[PDB]
Every structure is written in structure tokens, then in C-alpha cells.
Amino acid sequence: SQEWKEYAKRVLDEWQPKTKLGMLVKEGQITDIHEIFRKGYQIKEPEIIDVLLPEVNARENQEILDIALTVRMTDSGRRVRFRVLAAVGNRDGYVGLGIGHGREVGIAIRKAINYAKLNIIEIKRGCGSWECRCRRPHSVPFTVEGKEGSVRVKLIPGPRGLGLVIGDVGKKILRLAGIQDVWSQTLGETRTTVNFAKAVFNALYNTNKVVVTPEMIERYGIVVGRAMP
Amino acid sequence: MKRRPRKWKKKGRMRWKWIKKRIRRLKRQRKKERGL
Amino acid sequence: VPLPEGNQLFGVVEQALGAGWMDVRCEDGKIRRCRIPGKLRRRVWIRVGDLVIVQPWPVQSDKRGDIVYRYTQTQVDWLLRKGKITQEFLTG
Amino acid sequence: PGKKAPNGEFAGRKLKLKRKKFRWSDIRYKRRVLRLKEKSDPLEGAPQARGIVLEKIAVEAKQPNSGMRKAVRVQLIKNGKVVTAFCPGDGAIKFIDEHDEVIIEGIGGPKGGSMGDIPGIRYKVVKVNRVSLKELVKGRKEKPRR
RNA sequence: GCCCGCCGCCUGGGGAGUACGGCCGCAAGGCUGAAACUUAAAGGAAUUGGCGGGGGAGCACUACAAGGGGUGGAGCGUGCGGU
RNA sequence: ACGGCUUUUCCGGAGUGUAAAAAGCUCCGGGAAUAAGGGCUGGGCAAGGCCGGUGGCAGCCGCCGCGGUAAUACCGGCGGCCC
Ligand SMILES: [Mg+2]
Ligand SMILES: [Mg+2]
Ligand SMILES: [Mg+2]
Ligand SMILES: [Mg+2]
Ligand SMILES: [Mg+2]
Ligand SMILES: [Mg+2]
Ligand SMILES: [Mg+2]
Ligand SMILES: [Mg+2]
Ligand SMILES: [Mg+2]
Ligand SMILES: [Zn+2]
Prior knowledge:
The structure is cut from a larger assembly and holds chains A (229 residues), B (36 residues), C (92 residues) and D (146 residues). With 36 residues, chain B is mainly alpha-helical.
């Protein structure tokens, strides 16, 4: 954590913002990661997240989900292209998913990491299982669903200490968001990694779409964004 | 006969109408050899 | 150049039957439906009317056999001059 | 197509009948209940069988592979039927001679059938004259009765 | 599309809408309908190319049209196949 | 490689045990002595880009696929992985 403070300070001085939100963040009018959501802004500069959430650059907070190479046909042979699917997060309350393309693997990886920061979202965590009523943010607070292509995903709250009962792609995505225990059910073709990952991402995003009362926040221990002990 | 519209597609097989005619010719012969 | 050794004997190809099957007339006055091993099938082209070595199958050794070697023009000419085989067997 | 039927509270009989009717379209269920495998299995439901070798053969591989696979014809002692069995190992066919007795078992392909590039062969040899064939192929043991 | 009902049908590709049995029809035919065995795909929608005895637009004397001179027939120089 | 230690287990005794025995259990003497295999090693799926043989042959292969004289996939050596 100490290193990332000075890293964020270093990036902040040598950055020339190009957009309105970048100008606000450079001037110090916006100081916390939570202040850029829920008001319709556009996010086009990756330095915003570097300044506000410096720990998305740690090696342990990034994941290369998949690498594929695809072919376009021409009269002079086959032209090869790389597609990389990647994700980042802070292991507390924020997560992003991105795809990058390039002529070689390194360029594709760099672009995929770059686009994942621009697609960042914040989620809600809690405890809603019938056999664990502990009010601590270790799972999803209620059953949620998401879909992409032919893939359907349903996430179900689980007891503390159970683990992530889901395929590996879901394991990595849910781990980067700060979730420890969950049950799941799926339909469709999960071997298509892109659609699987996007479906889990949509299911996580849909925790913000469920109406809740002030009693429920107390009951399920619902936390938005950073846990903040 | 029962309908199998999958059989009418022409990729990798001969025309279904004439297969049907061939089968019907072959069935007459078995019927006639039975009554003898 | 190599000669038959054992139950092997000469033969004259008469007609190809397809799918790697030939019809060979042997030296013992028998017609045999012979099978070509695939090892030499891919690299040696055989045409009707050639001197070849045929080994009959161990079971039913009267109509089936395997062709093992083909004799070129120089080898068959040398054999004809030496006298191990006659001309009328080749010409029929 | 409308809603799945019947959903009524007092319609259990028709629902059970519907499920029973369409279960016969399942090939796995039909073969077990009618015992279709038992009626045609030359091994009569056994996991291994004992037989006598009649002759040696060689079988060509399927395209696009090239080669010959060494096999034997076996006559089963329990019912007199004749099957073909593969001999695994490098140079294993030398240890088989006509009129030997062998123990054979399945070859382990999909749905209990053939495997690889040798369709038509469903079994393999395991013992020869009550000695393991794997031993003979490696060494460590010598075939009895010369 | 979201919901409340009832009936019919489907369960990898072939063998096969075949064999056997039954009912119906003067006949031609209709309705019902397996197995042994064989096989790793069969099937759908969309993408980039290549191709069409498909359409349009352009171009070239190693294309044509309008022309000038020829080679192909003989003997010889030289290169190639065969013997 | 040096120096030390212990005796579950192993060898020889006394008691107890048992209808009688045998095991077992408590003591005594000797001594590291008496004790590791099976499968796998291209991907699925943990583990070698090493060496020598063979050369679409021999062989492997649940499936996908290897082998055509420069084989990480067959046979053997030396390593390594799982239990
Ligand atoms: Mg082109
Ligand atoms: Mg959609
Ligand atoms: Mg259809
Ligand atoms: Mg009939
Ligand atoms: Mg020209
Ligand atoms: Mg002209
Ligand atoms: Mg001339
Ligand atoms: Mg090895
Ligand atoms: Mg591995
Ligand atoms: Zn809990």
C-alpha cells in the first residue's frame, strides 16, 4: 500500500489530462474512486484509475483469462491476429473486464489490460444464505443472474468458508472482486470463454438493479464499494 | 411412406424421388414372389 | 536380381481387379487372385504383363498370394539369356 | 407451442403416463430393459473368456494411417463361436502358435467396442498358456511347454 | 415477449420408412413400424477469400481490330528428349 | 563421512492368557540390524525441448492424433511427477 501512494503521486504530476473528468481529478476536486460513478460521465483516460485506484497495477490484481489466435484468408496466405481476454480488480469492491487485439501477443496484452481499466464497475457484497447469517461481506447478498451469447449464469449465496463452487474463469473473476463463497448454476456452452466471462460480469453488475429497503441493509450486512472496517 | 424432409437435401446423395421409385420397384418383386 | 527362396515362384500379371488386387499366372499353371502389400504399393507401379515373385498364402495356397518384387527390363532380359525361365511363359 | 401440460393438481395419472411413454425414445434405457446386449454378446456377459487359437491374420489400418496389425482367430470354449483378437506389444505375435489356448478381454473403446484405427476387432489377448503376455513381451518369463 | 390451460410430436448420423405381423383398398397403394451391424461427426446461422459458360466499371500490340514483316515445307549452325 | 541414540518391527527366553493350544499383553538378552512397489512422462492432466536405436516399417492411440532418416508422442538409458 505504501508503494502505491508514491506511485500515484508520481503519475499525478507528469500527466496532462485531455478530458473533463481528467481535469477534475488533476485539480483535486475529485479524491475518491466512488465519486466517478452513478452520474453519467464518460471515462476515456486510463490515468484516472491509476491515480484513484493505484493497486490495479499490482501483479496479483491482474489476470490473463485467455489467449486465442484467429485467421483472415487472403490470396497471399493466412493473416494471423491475437485476441487476449483479461480482467483487473482491487480484491475489495471494484472489477473490470477487457479484450485487446494486436499483431503480436505483447501488444494485445497491453491493450487488453488498458481496456479493462476503462470498463471498471463497483458491486455490492453481503451474506444472504439460509445456513449462514453473519452480516459480513464474503458473498453475494442475494441470488443474481446474467447472460451472454448462449450462456446463462445464476449466482447463489453460500456459507462462510465454503469456497467458490464455479468454473475457473468465474473463480478468477469473483476472486478479483473480493468474494469468497458462492454456489452457482449454468446453462449453455461454457467452453466459450469470452461469453462465460461476460455472463459472470453481467451477473455481478446486476446486484445494483435489485430494489432494497433500509431494513435489508442491516440484515444482510450489505456493503457498497470498499469494505472499510 | 413417412416424411423425412432431411432426405430431400442434395448434398452427398442422389435424388429422393428416384430412390423412392427404386424402393417401390423392389417391393413389388418381393410381393409377387410371396404369392407363388 | 533377387531370386525366389522357398515356396516363392515367378508370375505374369494378367489383369488388375482394383483396390490393390491383381490376377497373376504363376509357373505351376495356376491362376491366382493376388494381393499387393501396401509397403511397395505406394512406390512401385505395376502394369499388366510383368515378371514378379509371388508367395502363396499359408492357408488355401492355390488361389491367393502376395506379390513381393517386380523384375525390371534388364533383370528379365538377363534371366531369359541365362535360361532360368523361358520366353513362352512370359509371352503366354 | 403453448405451456407444458398437464399442470393440473388432479392430473397425476396423465403426467406419469406421458413420462413413461417418452422414456422409450432413450436408447440407453431401452437396451437395458429389453436386455438387448445380453442376447447378442458372444462372451455371455462375462468380463473375460478362454478360447483356442485357429489361425494368425493381419489387418490393415484405417486411412490415413499405414501399417498392419497382428491378430488371431479364437474359438470360444463356452459356446463355440469364433471371434478376432488383437495381440498388443512389439513382436508379440511370435509367442502365439496355432492350437494354443488364450484368455481374452475387451479392448476398451467407446461404448464397449473397438478403438483407434482398427475397427472390427473388439478384444485383445491377455494370457497365453496361463502366462501373462506382457511379461513375455518384456522378458522376465519364458513360455512353458516349449 | 411476460403469464394462466389442454392435446399432438422429438431425443447423434446411417441401416429405414426397410424386414416381420396386423388392418384398410378392385388395383396402384395408405396407416402402423423394429433389430443385427456400421460410424465421429451429420446438421444450422453468419465471416474472410477464391471461383462462375452471373452483373457493372476499367486496362494491355508478351490481347484483338486496321496493317508491315514472318515461322511451320528444304539444307545446314546450335540447344533438348530418346536410343 | 564421522560420533552417538532407540528397538514399534525381527531372533532367543520367563509370566499371564486358552477347554488345551496358538495369537495378544507385561518383563529380560542381542542388534540399524530383518522390510518398496505399480503406473505415467505431446494436449485434456502433475511431470524432459536430453542421449542411443527404428525409418508410413515396427509400434502407440479411451478421444484428439503421432510415426515418410534431424521422433519432447514408438523401443531402451538417465532424469522427473502421482499415489
Ligand atoms: Mg486476389
Ligand atoms: Mg444478445
Ligand atoms: Mg427438421
Ligand atoms: Mg406388409
Ligand atoms: Mg500470343
Ligand atoms: Mg490482329
Ligand atoms: Mg524448317
Ligand atoms: Mg521413455
Ligand atoms: Mg502441465
Ligand atoms: Zn455469512
